[PDB]
Amino acid sequence: SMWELTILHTNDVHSRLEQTSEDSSKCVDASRCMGGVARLFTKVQQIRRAEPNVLLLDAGDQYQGTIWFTVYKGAEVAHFMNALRYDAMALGNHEFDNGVEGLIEPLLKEAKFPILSANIKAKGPLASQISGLYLPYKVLPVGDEVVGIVGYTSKETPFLSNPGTNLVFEDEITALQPEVDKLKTLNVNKIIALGHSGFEMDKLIAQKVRGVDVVVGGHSNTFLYTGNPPSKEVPAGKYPFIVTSDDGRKVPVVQAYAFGKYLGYLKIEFDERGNVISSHGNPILLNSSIPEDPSIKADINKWRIKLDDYSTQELGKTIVYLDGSSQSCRFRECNMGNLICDAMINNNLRHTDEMFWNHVSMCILNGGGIRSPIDERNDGTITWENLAAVLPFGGTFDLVQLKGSTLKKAFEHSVHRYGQSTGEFLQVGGIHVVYDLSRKPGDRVVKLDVLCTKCRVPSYDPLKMDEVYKVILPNFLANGGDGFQMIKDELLRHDSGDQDINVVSTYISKMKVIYPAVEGRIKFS
Amino acid sequence: SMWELTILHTNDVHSRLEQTSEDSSKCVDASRCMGGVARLFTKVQQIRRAEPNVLLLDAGDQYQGTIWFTVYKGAEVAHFMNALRYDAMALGNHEFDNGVEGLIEPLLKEAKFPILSANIKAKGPLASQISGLYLPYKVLPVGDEVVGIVGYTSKETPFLSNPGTNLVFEDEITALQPEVDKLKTLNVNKIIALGHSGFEMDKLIAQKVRGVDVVVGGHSNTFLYTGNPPSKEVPAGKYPFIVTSDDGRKVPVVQAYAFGKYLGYLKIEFDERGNVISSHGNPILLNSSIPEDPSIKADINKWRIKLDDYSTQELGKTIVYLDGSSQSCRFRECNMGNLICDAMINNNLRHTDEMFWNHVSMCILNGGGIRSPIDERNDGTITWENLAAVLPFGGTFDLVQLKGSTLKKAFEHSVHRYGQSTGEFLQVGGIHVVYDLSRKPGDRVVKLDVLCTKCRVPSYDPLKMDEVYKVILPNFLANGGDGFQMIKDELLRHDSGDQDINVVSTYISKMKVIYPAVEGRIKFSHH
Ligand SMILES: O=P(O)(O)[C@@](CO)(Cc1nn[nH]n1)OC[C@H]1O[C@@H](n2ncc3c(NC4CCCC4)nc(Cl)nc32)[C@H](O)[C@@H]1O
Ligand SMILES: O=P(O)(O)[C@@](CO)(Cc1nn[nH]n1)OC[C@H]1O[C@@H](n2ncc3c(NC4CCCC4)nc(Cl)nc32)[C@H](O)[C@@H]1O
Ligand SMILES: *[C@@H]1O[C@H](CO)[C@@H](O)[C@H](O)[C@H]1NC(C)=O
Ligand SMILES: *[C@@H]1O[C@H](CO)[C@@H](O)[C@H](O)[C@H]1NC(C)=O
Ligand SMILES: [Ca+2]
Ligand SMILES: [Ca+2]
Ligand SMILES: [Zn+2]
Numbered sequence A: 001s002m003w004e005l006t007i008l009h010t011n012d013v014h015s016r017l018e019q020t021s022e023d024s025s026k027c028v029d030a031s032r033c034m035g036g037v038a039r040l041f042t043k044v045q046q047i048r049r050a051e052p053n054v055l056l057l058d059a060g061d062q063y064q065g066t067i068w069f070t071v072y073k074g075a076e077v078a079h080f081m082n083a084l085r086y087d088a089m090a091l092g093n094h095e096f097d098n099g100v101e102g103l104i105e106p107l108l109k110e111a112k113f114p115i116l117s118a119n120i121k122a123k124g125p126l127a128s129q130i131s132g133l134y135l136p137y138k139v140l141p142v143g144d145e146v147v148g149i150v151g152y153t154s155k156e157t158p159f160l161s162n163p164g165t166n167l168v169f170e171d172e173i174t175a176l177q178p179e180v181d182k183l184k185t186l187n188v189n190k191i192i193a194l195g196h197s198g199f200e201m202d203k204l205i206a207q208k209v210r211g212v213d214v215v216v217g218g219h220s221n222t223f224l225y226t227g228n229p230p231s232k233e234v235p236a237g238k239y240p241f242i243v244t245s246d247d248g249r250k251v252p253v254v255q256a257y258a259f260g261k262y263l264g265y266l267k268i269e270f271d272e273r274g275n276v277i278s279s280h281g282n283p284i285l286l287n288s289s290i291p292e293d294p295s296i297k298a299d300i301n302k303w304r305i306k307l308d309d310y311s312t313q314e315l316g317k318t319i320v321y322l323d324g325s326s327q328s329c330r331f332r333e334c335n336m337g338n339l340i341c342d343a344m345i346n347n348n349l350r351h352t353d354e355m356f357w358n359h360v361s362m363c364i365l366n367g368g369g370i371r372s373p374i375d376e377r378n379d380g381t382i383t384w385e386n387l388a389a390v391l392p393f394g395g396t397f398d399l400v401q402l403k404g405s406t407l408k409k410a411f412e413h414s415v416h417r418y419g420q421s422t423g424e425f426l427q428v429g430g431i432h433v434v435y436d437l438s439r440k441p442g443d444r445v446v447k448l449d450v451l452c453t454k455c456r457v458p459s460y461d462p463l464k465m466d467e468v469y470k471v472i473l474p475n476f477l478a479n480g481g482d483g484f485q486m487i488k489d490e491l492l493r494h495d496s497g498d499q500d501i502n503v504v505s506t507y508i509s510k511m512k513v514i515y516p517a518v519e520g521r522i523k524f525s
Numbered sequence B: 001s002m003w004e005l006t007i008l009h010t011n012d013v014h015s016r017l018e019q020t021s022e023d024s025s026k027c028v029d030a031s032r033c034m035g036g037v038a039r040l041f042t043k044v045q046q047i048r049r050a051e052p053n054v055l056l057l058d059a060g061d062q063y064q065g066t067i068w069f070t071v072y073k074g075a076e077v078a079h080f081m082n083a084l085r086y087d088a089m090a091l092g093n094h095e096f097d098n099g100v101e102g103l104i105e106p107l108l109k110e111a112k113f114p115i116l117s118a119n120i121k122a123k124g125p126l127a128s129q130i131s132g133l134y135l136p137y138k139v140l141p142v143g144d145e146v147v148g149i150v151g152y153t154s155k156e157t158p159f160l161s162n163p164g165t166n167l168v169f170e171d172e173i174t175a176l177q178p179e180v181d182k183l184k185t186l187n188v189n190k191i192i193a194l195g196h197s198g199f200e201m202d203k204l205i206a207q208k209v210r211g212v213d214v215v216v217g218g219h220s221n222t223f224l225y226t227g228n229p230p231s232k233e234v235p236a237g238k239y240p241f242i243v244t245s246d247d248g249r250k251v252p253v254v255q256a257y258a259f260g261k262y263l264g265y266l267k268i269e270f271d272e273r274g275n276v277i278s279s280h281g282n283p284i285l286l287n288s289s290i291p292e293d294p295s296i297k298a299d300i301n302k303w304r305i306k307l308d309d310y311s312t313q314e315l316g317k318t319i320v321y322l323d324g325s326s327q328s329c330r331f332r333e334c335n336m337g338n339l340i341c342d343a344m345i346n347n348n349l350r351h352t353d354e355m356f357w358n359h360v361s362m363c364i365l366n367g368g369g370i371r372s373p374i375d376e377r378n379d380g381t382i383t384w385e386n387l388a389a390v391l392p393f394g395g396t397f398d399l400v401q402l403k404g405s406t407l408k409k410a411f412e413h414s415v416h417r418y419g420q421s422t423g424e425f426l427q428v429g430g431i432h433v434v435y436d437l438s439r440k441p442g443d444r445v446v447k448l449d450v451l452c453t454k455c456r457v458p459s460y461d462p463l464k465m466d467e468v469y470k471v472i473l474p475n476f477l478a479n480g481g482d483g484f485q486m487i488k489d490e491l492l493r494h495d496s497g498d499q500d501i502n503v504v505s506t507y508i509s510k511m512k513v514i515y516p517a518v519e520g521r522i523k524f525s526h527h
């Protein structure tokens, strides 16, 4: 005898409540738009009506990405996930972006489903405050069986978000194994690991955590597919990805890209003792072939009324595609990066009253801070809402004095673990860098020319290690985010800047028509 | 017996009536300013009081370069050259910039000294109109002797200016020799060739034209000096430069850079039969050590009143030196070029109602069209006057559809005679070009990448020969100037654009603070 479970799964939805363009920017041409919570609900109900044993799971990073989260601050997440009737969610890194209070009062108190993390431990006054609002696991009834779901969250969360110093983020394998053993002693024979640490960590969990039957992941924005993929996303492996564990077991690992563009869909056949005997499926592309549910869409429109103040005024026009996609901006020079760096540099030079920074022409910008493209095909209109999708974090473009050796160390860090879509890869202004990736990590920077400052005509001269340079960058990077510890430690001055999104809107308002290009600021050898 | 003559000479003054900064841009810090007509007058008078036999000569290109010429149109040239008591002038190419009417009514009718060119022949109805207003030669009394001065003008004048199709520009050597022979039969044994064809042609004249004793030149902006030079300009040779002629004679050739920064000064010792026994001198740096003459300065201030409309409004600010010097912009990437090209591109995109050119991101700009720097040390203010020194010509930034093969032929022409400070060297926008100069002319372009247009994100892709590109450029280049004959002939569309100086002021007004760099748009390689 066999027992079939259908796992429906989203991850890194990142406040894409409404349907989006193919690239996850704002919907303009409705006939070609994709995803959003109303469309997901239609596909979820289609599966639920057909399959008797169904779990709808989220692997974190619902928080942050559009004006939805800027305005509603997680109430939209609670509300629409409840309307969809998610069975469980794992805490991601972006769930702590508005502090622990930003997690508790909107999401944890209003969610009608369990929220999960087994490697986040609470200490101090916070322990009693957050007791039971999230859990290490939940044991869910599914038909006449039970399925254990055990949660996890990235160890990098303190370095990427605002979880506060009373939350300790343990190792995933060390925290998960006792919980999985606890569930076995409670006669839960089917166990799903649901969490938010990336596809590599998901694979290690599948391997090393004995008793885990399936890993549903997130954080790396990984697309897995078996067969011919339905859109632009290139699959990193088959769906599901099969790990061979330490005790010889085949453990399926899944992820469902990002932005609610796909619904992950895995059918698993279990024996009577909760061993996986087979698995199959694929992520389902939520395109115009699936209608947005009328009820959920009507509710979305009601919540949408408050947001329409942010889409009113045209700040300017683009006549080129502003490529702010992760696949470009984390792997090579992207023109959205160039735009943002040029805006950073240009805005700073209006502050003529402050003479220490009035010649700053160099810029560094973490690629992962660029959160969305903007489309050029609607007479390429750029509103505030469009900008808020690119720059949702409410950071500042701060000013730092750095030694040359600090700067070379940062450019080595930029490509130290290249090829995994991590956000540390640097977009630049007033810098020409050339990488050779065949060299070992810490020695991949082969050419590095920067704009001179003690010179009448600015030209790109080679960077000297002993020389000091002035750079404009996100406060995230100045304070040591993305493992840029050399910046925070070794910087000589650090001034607070202007607000990031205001800098870019000012710049676009000034220029009227923008046309940034890929110029060979970042080259490969 | 011996007879000593002192030749004082200017060339390519280019409307620098007032004193200038070291680089020839507007005077701001008066304590370190140079040249101008008031200072020149002081130095000329010092020499005249000291030496009995003095000629003050001009080798052309007084016309064009600042608002002085924009407003007064050659009347300031006539007026201040007359006040200085120039003995003779040769017609340069820029003397024809406002047509033949622009030469006649201001300069030729009001000048109290002879104006000279022996290789400009007038035909049609214009011949009788301009007969004798300029001359092939003039024979000037100097003390008890006479000195013949014979004129010449660049054969490239029709391709650089607006002389009209009724003026023919003959070969200089063929035109000069009969005049020099004629003067020998008229018992003129001392002959100066004064003209405007460049230092190379000056040397050929010295060599080939039998009877010429001295060549006073212009057009190439050549600095010659003997000893340690007093300023930024690198000497091309000794002063005077000595040609050994075909008929066995040492002929001194002189020039005096440009912009009235130096007064050329050559002492020649002649024998009784008008042969040069020796020559010596140097150009005199007209710096703060020579005071401005009170009379000429007071007259300059009176004429200056009408011009002060052009310097009131600050259009914007630069925080970098805008290198618009000939030594940069005709030899490599200069940031003034980059600025002008970016302004050309940016202004064009405001015309959204016209959909054929609304994605144009490629620009070519002849380096010789960039006429002056702008300084950054006075809180680097940019007025209209400053801009008018960079872009004096009143051209337009026109729009052309060109084949790729046309564009590569233009980039080959850009460096075909590289190393001579000729204006055809191209400043660019949305183009990355790499030259190898060790290769032969017509095959020096080794890499040539341009911004794509049928593409969502613009990147620099290699230029395809069969593919067609849209480019913004000066109408000078579209109409075939600087020997860019491939553009005029092989272009597919040609629309008139906006006025050149208005494009750059609009852009500066928009940007407020400008900081253009040398970016590697133009590189050189030795493979
Ligand atoms: O799953 P994700 O979203 O975690 C992901 C994982 O690699 C993947 C992804 N790809 N596409 N969408 N998602 O990207 C993370 C990258 O994003 C950048 N990052 N994160 C936060 C943040 C920040 N501010 C903080 C401080 C106050 C709360 C927010 N500020 C700036 Cl400038 N960058 C920021 C960084 O590069 C990091 O490596
Ligand atoms: O002695 P010069 O001054 O002749 C000189 C000789 O090599 C030397 C020089 N160096 N520094 N100052 N002088 O430069 C010539 C270069 O100047 C450029 N040039 N000339 C005219 C002109 C023009 N318009 C004209 C057309 C109708 C009347 C106005 N338009 C644009 Cl865009 N360029 C123009 C061109 O490159 C040429 O090669
Ligand atoms: C939607 O996706 C399916 C595959 O999942 C594909 O066959 C279909 O062509 C798509 N429909 C559109 C774009 O309307
Ligand atoms: C002016 O030029 C003379 C002659 O070359 C030189 O000796 C002197 O130093 C200069 N005076 C200045 C810069 O004040
Ligand atoms: Ca099991
Ligand atoms: Ca003689
Ligand atoms: Zn995420």
Ligand SMILES: [Zn+2]
Binding pocket: A061, A092, A093, A094, A196, A218, A219, A220
């Ligand atoms: Zn994440």
Ligand SMILES: [Zn+2]
Binding pocket: B012, B014, B061, B094, B219
């Ligand atoms: Zn000239």
Ligand SMILES: [Zn+2]
Binding pocket: B061, B092, B093, B094, B196, B218, B219, B220
């Ligand atoms: Zn000339």
